[PDB]
Amino acid sequence: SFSLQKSEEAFNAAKNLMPGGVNSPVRAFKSVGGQPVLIDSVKGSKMWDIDGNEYIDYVGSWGPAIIGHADDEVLAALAETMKKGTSFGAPCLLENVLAEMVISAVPSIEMVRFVNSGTEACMGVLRLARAFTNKEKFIKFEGCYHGHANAFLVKAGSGVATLGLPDSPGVPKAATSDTLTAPYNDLEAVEKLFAAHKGEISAVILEPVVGNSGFIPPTPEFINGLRQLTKDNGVLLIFDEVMTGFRLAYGGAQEYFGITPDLTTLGKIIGGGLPVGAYGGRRDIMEMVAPAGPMYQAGTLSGNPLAMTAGIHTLKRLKQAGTYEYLDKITKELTNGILEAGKKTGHPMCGGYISGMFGFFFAEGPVYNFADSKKSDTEKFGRFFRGMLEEGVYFAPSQFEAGFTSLAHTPEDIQLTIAAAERVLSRI
Amino acid sequence: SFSLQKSEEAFNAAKNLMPGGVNSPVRAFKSVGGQPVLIDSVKGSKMWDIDGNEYIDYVGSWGPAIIGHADDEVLAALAETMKKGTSFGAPCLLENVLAEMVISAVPSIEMVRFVNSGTEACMGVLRLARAFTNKEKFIKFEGCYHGHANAFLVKAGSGVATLGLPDSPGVPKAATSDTLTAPYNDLEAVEKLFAAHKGEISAVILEPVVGNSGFIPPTPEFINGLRQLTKDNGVLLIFDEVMTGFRLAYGGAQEYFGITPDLTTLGKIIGGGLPVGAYGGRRDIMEMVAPAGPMYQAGTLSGNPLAMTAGIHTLKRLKQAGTYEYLDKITKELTNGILEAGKKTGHPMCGGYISGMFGFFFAEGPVYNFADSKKSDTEKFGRFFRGMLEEGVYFAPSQFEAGFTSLAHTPEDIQLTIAAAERVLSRI
Ligand SMILES: Cc1ncc(COP(=O)(O)O)c(CN)c1O
Ligand SMILES: Cc1ncc(COP(=O)(O)O)c(CN)c1O
């Protein structure tokens, strides 16, 4: 009897109010049939839509909800804090507290600047790297996402890796002209870029595990190679940990892999469900940021007390013993259970997980890069995704997004999910 | 005795955690003596610091607090909404509600996209204008502020006889090369740019009343001229109403002046004290925004239900009869009271106001542009600012920021503020 009738009505109205009916493109479900699920509420590992359907959720609002949606302690903290005002536009003690917690948690971060989104964090960190090195070019990887600042919106493909051409209309060629690209997991391509642009490269930036082209982890050779190559040449290494931060380990991907970058961006989890980003790193670099130094970046709502409170209480929960070990346990079971279901029902699949982050592809694999991920059978993914909705499971509405587990997911949530997957896979 | 003991200790600690001890440059008080006031709470028109000092606040968290800080109805709405979760990462009904309200309120907006800051809104609107027109250049005015995207960080004087130059390290030369500039209130300079760059200009963007170089209103000739000139040449007119929106009138400066732009950015008031921005305008233009069209912009926390709720209830209050008439009454009295106090005490001053936005300069004036504003006696401003703190009044900690009133400011507040101003002015 599964119905999305109320979502259908409200989304039809939305399309005449907002472009494509949404405030972010993935939300429009275009690759999975075009009927988004409008959300009424979330709690723990569950989401309820406006039709009243319940789902075991593996999106976690794209990463923030690692301790569970609408956590009671976080809500109580927000309720108390808001009595004193939600925005100050001036320093407050909560900013000191969250800053101290982040510096303690994340290996590379000795000093930190809070902003309102991952997009802002990545803008700031790029400007900072360019300012510190007095160099304009940088390297990013095809398939990585660093928000929508113009410099990141660069076209990749045959014959254009060194050209910095725009990947979207409205982005002038000049804006992307200092952006170089290489394939993820291709150290040799990066070596070639270094050789052809001696003295011009400020930084290499990467998602230390790709989550925005599906789940794609780095090979040890690649990620160590980047650390060595950058260090040997006085180039900065930047980890975009907006998604991996506080999710792969308390100290993020840099702790998980034991590789320490020069600068790090954060977001999502550090806002505890409110809009917050950050960039931080080596103190000598961070001292270039205004008003300590000449590099300009500013925000009105940055460091607001609600966001700080939510972040503080989220990190306090995560810092407790056994957190990441629990995520590993349930996510290993989930990932291997889904892949085994695919094997049993005759569908080529591959995938993997680290702590609370996972993904699977309808492809033989292995998947090492963006190009590999494009081998995925997206028609089949769509059938799987829609079938799972009907069975009460909500995965990311795209083959090209990672999935997320939370501390509120139980072993039973996982078992019910695997069972549903087996049923759906047996039918598609 | 006026004591900032606890603020001094906490700010010293902050300087070892965040660059310059702050999350936005103006907060460090560098132009007014360097000892920021750390905030404990805000309510109505008042702020209390961590040392227990009370102030009548004319900053309003830089614009969001137009109905008063910590409004009971807004807080009650947040308390109810948060029970259902603070972030969904997917569409919800509250997004439809705020979108409808914004479309109704703002003349130019037929379709709207929500984002997490004014910086993001201005990035998006510029990319959109460039995409729609298929042209790369745009015009910005000296003294206007549109957030910190690279294209806007252009050095004073550049972008006229030489390509736009970086105003900050870390901004590549190429990034500002498509930015043209002119003095505010200089229509002739804009006409010259149009004639010199035929087929190359996407848009003119401006604060329709400047608030980021002090308070500087447009002359009728300038703003009327811009609307006709853009129309005549197929160039988009963009109003950055992040600060003026919902403050000069329910429909912002465009309503107040009766001049309808093609695109508008919003922020601040629209989030009711939470991080929210938006860009919107003519439907045919907005249909280019992904996923309706090819122009890329995205955001994880965009349209989150907490921020939507806060905006909805803030706008609901503003829509009540008498709002802007009240703001006009108290702000006229405030502004003229301060200017009269300056005259009586022998200090050259000039200033002005519209509705809930005002400013004064320690300069003879009149001030028509950025260059004029820079004739201000900033040493005297600092003395005035610090003296007023001790009298229990908190103005913006800069000569180059506008001031803000709210529905919670009362004739009592205004009377007390003017009396304090005369006491301080008679002594500095
Ligand atoms: C790795 C990465 N970087 C940056 C961003 C941008 O963050 P936001 O959406 O908050 O702007 C995201 C969110 N998609 C992300 O996952
Ligand atoms: C006119 C204008 N435009 C854009 C911005 C940038 O907004 P945010 O600080 O939210 O990024 C500001 C700061 N209030 C502003 O005043």
Numbering used by the authors:
A (entry chain B), B (entry chain A): 7 to 434
From the paper:
GSAM, also named glutamate-1-semialdehyde aminotransferase (GSA-AT), is a pyridoxamine 5′-phosphate (PMP)/pyridoxal 5′-phosphate (PLP)-dependent enzyme. Clear electron density in the structure of AtGSA1 allowed the modelling of 428 residues in each monomer, with the first six N-terminal residues missing. The overall structure of AtGSA1 is similar to other known GSAM architectures and consists of three sequentially arranged domains: the N-terminal domain (Val1–Asp63, mature protein) comprises one α-helix and a three-stranded antiparallel β-sheet, the PMP/PLP-binding domain (Tyr64–Gly328), which is also the catalytic domain, contains a central seven-stranded β-sheet with one antiparallel and six parallel β-strands, and the C-terminal domain (Thr329–Ile434) is composed of a three-stranded antiparallel β-sheet with four helices covering the outer surface.
Here, we present the high-resolution structure of AtGSA1 at 1.25 Å resolution. Therefore, both PMP and PLP are modelled in the ligand density with occupancies of 0.54 and 0.46, respectively. Compared with subunit A, the gating loop of subunit B undergoes a dramatic conformational change as demonstrated by the large Cα deviations of the residues Lys161–Gly170. In addition, two forms of cofactor are observed within the active site of subunit B. Thus, the gating loop of subunit B may be in an intermediate state, and the disrupted network of hydrogen bonds between Gly163, Ser164 and Gly165, and Glu148 and Thr187 may result in the gating loop of subunit B becoming ready to close.
